[PDB]
Scaffold this active site. Structure first.
Site, PDB file in Angstrom:
ATOM      1  N   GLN A  18       0.662  -0.935  -0.121  1.00  0.00           N
ATOM      2  CA  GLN A  18       0.064  -0.151   0.152  1.00  0.00           C
ATOM      3  C   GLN A  18       0.773   1.538   0.052  1.00  0.00           C
ATOM      4  OE1 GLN A  18      -3.003  -0.064   2.892  1.00  0.00           O
ATOM      5  NE2 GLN A  18      -4.206   1.726   1.869  1.00  0.00           N
ATOM      6  N   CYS A  39      -7.091   0.332   1.472  1.00  0.00           N
ATOM      7  CA  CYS A  39      -6.561  -1.107   2.001  1.00  0.00           C
ATOM      8  C   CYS A  39      -7.506  -2.218   1.703  1.00  0.00           C
ATOM      9  CB  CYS A  39      -6.358  -1.050   3.640  1.00  0.00           C
ATOM     10  SG  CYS A  39      -7.636  -0.113   4.643  1.00  0.00           S
ATOM     11  N   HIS A  56      -8.847  -1.986   9.656  1.00  0.00           N
ATOM     12  CA  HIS A  56      -7.827  -2.176   8.312  1.00  0.00           C
ATOM     13  C   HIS A  56      -8.108  -3.524   7.848  1.00  0.00           C
ATOM     14  CE1 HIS A  56      -4.095  -1.644   6.188  1.00  0.00           C
ATOM     15  NE2 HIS A  56      -3.613  -2.672   6.690  1.00  0.00           N
ATOM     16  N   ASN A  96      -1.160  -8.404   5.765  1.00  0.00           N
ATOM     17  CA  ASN A  96      -1.462  -6.754   5.872  1.00  0.00           C
ATOM     18  C   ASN A  96      -0.965  -6.410   4.631  1.00  0.00           C
ATOM     19  OD1 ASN A  96      -1.094  -4.250   6.420  1.00  0.00           O
ATOM     20  ND2 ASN A  96       0.010  -4.476   8.390  1.00  0.00           N
ATOM     21  N   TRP A 146      -0.295  -3.460   3.665  1.00  0.00           N
ATOM     22  CA  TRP A 146       0.821  -2.408   3.949  1.00  0.00           C
ATOM     23  C   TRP A 146       2.130  -3.274   3.356  1.00  0.00           C
ATOM     24  CZ3 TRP A 146       0.549  -0.456   9.784  1.00  0.00           C
ATOM     25  CH2 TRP A 146      -0.567   0.576   9.660  1.00  0.00           C
TER      26      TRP A 146
HETATM   27  C1  LIG Z   1      -7.127   1.160   5.480  1.00  0.00           C
HETATM   28  O1  LIG Z   1      -6.752   0.572   6.811  1.00  0.00           O
HETATM   29  C2  LIG Z   1      -6.004   1.760   4.834  1.00  0.00           C
HETATM   30  O2  LIG Z   1      -6.261   2.197   3.641  1.00  0.00           O
HETATM   31  N1  LIG Z   1      -4.640   2.241   5.652  1.00  0.00           N
HETATM   32  C3  LIG Z   1      -3.661   2.972   4.989  1.00  0.00           C
HETATM   33  C4  LIG Z   1      -4.047   4.598   4.904  1.00  0.00           C
HETATM   34  C5  LIG Z   1      -4.639   4.962   6.123  1.00  0.00           C
HETATM   35  C6  LIG Z   1      -5.093   6.364   5.923  1.00  0.00           C
HETATM   36  C7  LIG Z   1      -4.960   7.008   5.018  1.00  0.00           C
HETATM   37  C8  LIG Z   1      -4.000   6.724   3.807  1.00  0.00           C
HETATM   38  C9  LIG Z   1      -3.740   5.112   3.605  1.00  0.00           C
HETATM   39  C10 LIG Z   1      -8.276   2.236   5.550  1.00  0.00           C
HETATM   40  C11 LIG Z   1      -7.891   3.612   6.403  1.00  0.00           C
HETATM   41  C12 LIG Z   1      -9.374   4.436   6.454  1.00  0.00           C
HETATM   42  C13 LIG Z   1      -9.441   4.986   5.217  1.00  0.00           C
HETATM   43  C14 LIG Z   1      -9.774   6.277   5.143  1.00  0.00           C
HETATM   44  C15 LIG Z   1      -8.998   7.278   5.845  1.00  0.00           C
HETATM   45  N2  LIG Z   1      -8.672   6.849   7.322  1.00  0.00           N
HETATM   46  C16 LIG Z   1      -8.713   5.369   7.485  1.00  0.00           C
HETATM   47  O3  LIG Z   1      -8.467   4.973   8.650  1.00  0.00           O
HETATM   48  N3  LIG Z   1      -9.368   1.407   6.092  1.00  0.00           N
HETATM   49  C17 LIG Z   1     -10.610   1.330   5.343  1.00  0.00           C
HETATM   50  O4  LIG Z   1     -10.685   1.555   4.261  1.00  0.00           O
HETATM   51  C18 LIG Z   1     -11.796   0.510   6.065  1.00  0.00           C
HETATM   52  C19 LIG Z   1     -11.372  -0.816   5.819  1.00  0.00           C
HETATM   53  C20 LIG Z   1     -12.303  -2.109   6.522  1.00  0.00           C
HETATM   54  C21 LIG Z   1     -12.607  -3.297   5.769  1.00  0.00           C
HETATM   55  C22 LIG Z   1     -13.594  -4.005   6.253  1.00  0.00           C
HETATM   56  C23 LIG Z   1     -14.149  -3.732   7.342  1.00  0.00           C
HETATM   57  F1  LIG Z   1     -14.622  -4.864   8.111  1.00  0.00           F
HETATM   58  C24 LIG Z   1     -13.639  -2.858   8.412  1.00  0.00           C
HETATM   59  C25 LIG Z   1     -12.978  -1.874   7.617  1.00  0.00           C
HETATM   60  N4  LIG Z   1     -13.084   1.182   5.703  1.00  0.00           N
HETATM   61  C26 LIG Z   1     -13.284   2.416   6.153  1.00  0.00           C
HETATM   62  O5  LIG Z   1     -12.348   3.065   6.931  1.00  0.00           O
HETATM   63  C27 LIG Z   1     -14.621   2.785   5.415  1.00  0.00           C
HETATM   64  C28 LIG Z   1     -15.313   1.912   4.699  1.00  0.00           C
HETATM   65  C29 LIG Z   1     -16.286   2.443   4.253  1.00  0.00           C
HETATM   66  C30 LIG Z   1     -17.541   2.098   3.396  1.00  0.00           C
HETATM   67  C31 LIG Z   1     -18.465   3.154   3.006  1.00  0.00           C
HETATM   68  C32 LIG Z   1     -18.475   4.630   3.487  1.00  0.00           C
HETATM   69  C33 LIG Z   1     -17.237   4.942   4.230  1.00  0.00           C
HETATM   70  C34 LIG Z   1     -16.258   3.919   4.645  1.00  0.00           C
HETATM   71  O6  LIG Z   1     -15.036   4.075   5.233  1.00  0.00           O
END
Ligand SMILES: *[C@@](O)(C(=O)NCc1ccccc1)[C@H](C[C@@H]1CCCNC1=O)NC(=O)[C@H](Cc1ccc(F)cc1)NC(=O)c1cc2ccccc2o1
Ligand SMILES: [Ca+2]
Ligand SMILES: [Ca+2]
Length: 327
Positions: free
Chosen positions: A77, A83, A240, A264, A266
């Site tokens: 990532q 993620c 995540h 992960n 990452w």
């Molecule tokens: C990941 O952890 C990720 O991409 N991490 C690296 C990163 C973080 C922050 C900025 C850049 C890179 C995502 C991190 C979120 C993303 C938005 C910004 N801040 C965060 O913490 N995590 C997700 O996208 C979760 C993943 C998830 C998947 C399955 C599950 F059961 C629970 C979580 N999803 C969200 O954060 C999320 C999902 C979703 C759906 C619809 C509307 C809004 C929304 O937010």
């Protein structure tokens, strides 16, 4: 069989560019600020500081589409919150037939190259063929978003770009559900499991799902927004998406112990508890099982006992291709 996304015909565009001696420039998703984003990645965002658009042939001497296979270690990532999508790509790599549909393997930066690549995505109930040019976001000479552990490998950067394209921007990928990615890569349908209220045969369900090439992911619930992306004491990440990439039972201290492997996206930061890469549990398994299963490498991938998995993770998703017609 796949329909052409926005009418763009990969082979006709490639052949034309090769004949006219030019590189493809994608009118549908240009290398401009709005393809990065609108707000957090918008035109006046500090987070776009320094970002340029470069083809891999403008970056390195011998860029490759695929190096040593298209595998889950190629999904590391970048600076985007996708993620969920990256976990889905990593899980996809374990299903060789679907991987070869989504990622057409006969693409190259050498013979036949015209600066255009294509991918297949499941979109609104049908497979569609999506083209991209190979201009990619770069900062300080490196990919900004997803990249491979192999620095000269570009298939996953380009697949992520194609998925951004169908969503209108990279920033549209920030925050999401792994199930969306699973389904858009397979045409399958996701079942969700709350691990606190899991059936007694869940481990067997996981084993059979991995065996048949379903895609699996897992995550840890957040208690509040401040919990988002928090790293626990044992180096799990909350809120995540992880890929579930394996499962195996081993003989251990006179018992059979069920293990589960996850990754992960990452590409780094791993569980430090039992069955982690350098843990002592491995000293009391069979030397062949230890050699087959344990890899001492900071690669984002590790094993846990199923007992610990059920204690630490909160949800699991399984995207099956044909859940009502199994084998
Ligand atoms: C990941 O952890 C990720 O991409 N991490 C690296 C990163 C973080 C922050 C900025 C850049 C890179 C995502 C991190 C979120 C993303 C938005 C910004 N801040 C965060 O913490 N995590 C997700 O996208 C979760 C993943 C998830 C998947 C399955 C599950 F059961 C629970 C979580 N999803 C969200 O954060 C999320 C999902 C979703 C759906 C619809 C509307 C809004 C929304 O937010
Ligand atoms: Ca590779
Ligand atoms: Ca590891």
């Amino acid at each position: 069989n796949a329909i052409k996304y926005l009418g763009q015909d990969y082979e006709q565009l490639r052949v034309r560019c090769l004949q006219s001696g030019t590189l493809f420039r994608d009118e549908a998703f240009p290398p401009v600020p709005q393809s990065l984003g609108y707000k957090d990645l918008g035109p006046n965002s500090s987070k776009t500081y320094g970002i340029k658009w470069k083809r891999p042939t403008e970056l390195l001497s011998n860029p490759q589409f695929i190096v040593d296979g298209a595998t889950r270690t190629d999904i590391c990532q970048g600076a985007l919150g996708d993620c969920w999508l990256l976990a889905a790509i990593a899980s996809l790599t374990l299903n060789d037939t679907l991987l070869h549909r989504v990622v057409p393997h006969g693409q190259s930066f050498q013979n036949g190259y015209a600066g255009i690549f294509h991918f297949q995505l499941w979109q609104f109930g049908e497979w569609v063929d999506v083209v991209v040019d190979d201009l990619l976001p770069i900062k300080d000479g490196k990919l900004v978003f997803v990249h491979s552990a192999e620095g000269n490998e570009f298939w996953s950067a380009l697949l992520e770009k194609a998925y951004a394209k169908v969503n209108g921007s990279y920033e549209a990928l920030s925050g999401g559900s792994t199930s969306e990615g699973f389904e858009d890569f397979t045409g399958g349908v996701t079942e969700w499991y709350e691990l606190r209220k899991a059936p007694s045969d869940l481990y067997q369900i996981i084993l059979k799902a991995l065996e048949r090439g379903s895609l699996l992911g897992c995550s840890i619930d957040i208690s509040s927004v401040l919990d988002m992306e928090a790293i626990t004491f044992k180096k799990l990440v909350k809120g995540h998406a992880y890929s579930v990439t394996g499962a195996k039972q081993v003989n251990y201290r006179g018992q059979v112990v069920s293990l589960i492997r996850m990754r992960n996206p990452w590409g780094e930061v791993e569980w430090t508890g039992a069955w982690s890469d350098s843990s002592s549990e491995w000293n009391n398994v069979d030397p062949y099982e230890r050699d087959q299963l344990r890899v001492k490498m900071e690669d984002g991938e590790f094993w846990m006992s199923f007992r610990d998995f059920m204690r630490e993770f909160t949800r699991l998703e399984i995207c099956n291709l044909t859940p009502d017609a199994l084998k």
